[model samples]
Target: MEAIPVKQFVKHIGELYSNNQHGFSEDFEEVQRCTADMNITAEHSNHPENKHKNRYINILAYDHSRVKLRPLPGSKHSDYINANYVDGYNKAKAYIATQGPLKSTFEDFWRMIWEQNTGIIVMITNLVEKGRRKCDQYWPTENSEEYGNIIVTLKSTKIHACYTVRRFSIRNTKNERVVIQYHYTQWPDMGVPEYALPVLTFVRRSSAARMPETGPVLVHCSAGVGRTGTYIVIDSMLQQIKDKSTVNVLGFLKHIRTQRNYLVQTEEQYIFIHDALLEAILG
Candidate 1:
């Protein structure tokens, strides 16, 4: 419970980052064996269109109260996608890590948004990367349009150097959900952001503006693991720092992997978390 000097704290984190390259405990095999027990049904990978989408990505959310998309009456793509309910600091359910919406699951994506009572969607990838399609353009350009049972209308949009913020008014038959979409475009696929400052700044401004206390903040990258995992772990680390002067980032992330598999996708991404924490700790 004691707060150490910032110099010593940051240095300790640097060593922790260097030492734990796998982002796992020294008994990583036992930790991995435990993770194997959390496996839930891969319900989406048997279908024609959906099967190819997540057949290669091993990350899946556990079914222990995991956030489920509201079932549509007769839709083909309503069942599953690579989305999960991830916990934040001290909160069991505060962040949702999901894959970028597929062309088929775009409607279901909106349905998950409304059903989860989400007020903020933190999109962490571009619509295209290196001329390759990453995520479907789920939002409308100007006028409102129907996505499955829900209709989404673009309210207003603001563009920034690193991201675009869009305000949308989403409605179903009986309920309405309004959300701010923070589209961060600077991060690359399968890699780290250029600097941690812009990302930390993005979290500060966006969370201050729209991080929901009542509902989870939705975060996504292409596969919902690498960049999304990094962002959530970083946010939890920073939030923990505010509540307590110290935290076990490695331990926190390991538990997160128990809930949502393959979180913090790469060891380099793990190092990035420490780098971001050092900046926040030292800056």
Candidate 2:
């Protein structure tokens, strides 16, 4: 029940590094065991009608925390979306961790954004990686594109060293809102980034763009599990460290896996979270 003070947390990282067995690998596997079968059902996500909506066959959304779309009149199974409402450091529904939109689910993706009143989206994967399509281009490349009842218009674009910022004016029949997308372009195809500073900075920029009243920040990678989970851990831990002067990497990781399965997917990604948090705590 003791808080992991920031200083001790950093020191532990160095100690963990020296012994890989009881270090990142052990912690990562322990989390895997903890969340192996949370007994949380995914009946809605597994329904025959909604099976095609998911990006990965095995990565199913938990029914309890899944984001339900506003049911369209006369539509049979219109409420299914491959997304989940995950809590941040101290905020409830602080993020909607979801899979990168597929071509068929583009409309539903926009609908989730519009329905949830989301103000920011953080994309951590490229359209195509290693000659395979990772995620569909969900936004308009030019002026605007209509997805279901929502109209997404490209307002402006700003490029950075590691990420690109795009502004979109989103509108439906009755309301219009601006959504900013922070797309990190430097993540490698198979593993995490070489360094954690850029990701920390990227998180700061995305967090800064969000206002207090806006909807949950939407974060996604290919399957919405690997990189997406890593990002959320880093983002949440940064806040926890800033406010409480402490951090709990494994504790927070376990907490979020209850909301969405397979969060912080691999040992490498898990170790990366430690590295990023250390950098943030130090600098």
Candidate 3:
């Protein structure tokens, strides 16, 4: 607690969250009304320490898992996308929420794995979102794939009711690692899932399977903040509830935004968090 306490920060944000009195109610829905009007300093990605990344979006990355790109000569693009290192309840660099691979950054994406020792890549979008390629098929679907010096081969797979899990054995000249890609299809673009249980089930599986030392669990939706933030927020809060028996979604989310711009994207996504956690927490 410095100039502002964590508890005080939460309520202060609530009081000033919305403008013109959207009069939004509590829980997830309550959070969004404020966020909808809440202006973002996301453009601050151009900040001194964070510049030089090829960024396709405004939300940026900071702290430990901030992927440092190989500085390209004559490259005018922002070297980073809308990604950030989100802290988990039990881990500091728990997850790296980023945008889907772009055509220009495919090599960099694999290099990111090589550089960071990533173990799990979670994709929550279909190939198309609202009729656009939300993310490139960075990994192989039916067979092996390669990018630069890295190799990715589909090792095994299991499909659940809500999502499909594909395992891959990734390798470079020096070492090898196993990576899992969990593609969640049911989540609609700019909307929440039908319920929270299926998403939780997927989270449980992904959390359990992530390789211990393979670095962070790479997470991304379209913008890497909307659905991505919702998932991280719920998972982190749920763990807190389990450990401390009390949870404050407001302060927790606001605090995390300092690390990643749009921690929670929309009113719908915010509402989903409440519905998701309210069920799990009560029972």
| Lowest-sum lDDT 10-residue window in model 3 | 1-10
lDDT tens digits, residues 178-222, model 2? 999999999988778999999999998898888879899999999
Q: lDDT tens string, model 3, 1-283? A: 1234334534534554366324223434544443555454544356654443334535565533455655556653335444567788768878888877776667678777767778888888887878877777788776777787788889888887789999888888532777788888888665578878898888777777776566888888776878888888878877777676666676677666666666688766765776676667546
Top-lDDT candidate index: 2
**lDDT scores of the candidates, listed in order:** 0.74, 0.90, 0.69
lDDT of 3: 0.69
Ranking by lDDT: 2, 1, 3
Q: What does each candidate score in C-alpha RMSD?
A: 3.6, 1.3, 6.1
Indicate the worst ten consecutive residues by lDDT in candidate 1: 22-31
> Candidate 1, TM-score vs. the true structure?
0.84
Better of 1 and 2 by lDDT: 2
Task: List residue ranges in candidate 3 displaced over 4 A.
Answer: 1-59, 62-65, 70-82
Candidate 2 RMSD computed on C-alpha atoms after optimal superposition onto the true structure:
1.3
lDDT of 1: 0.74
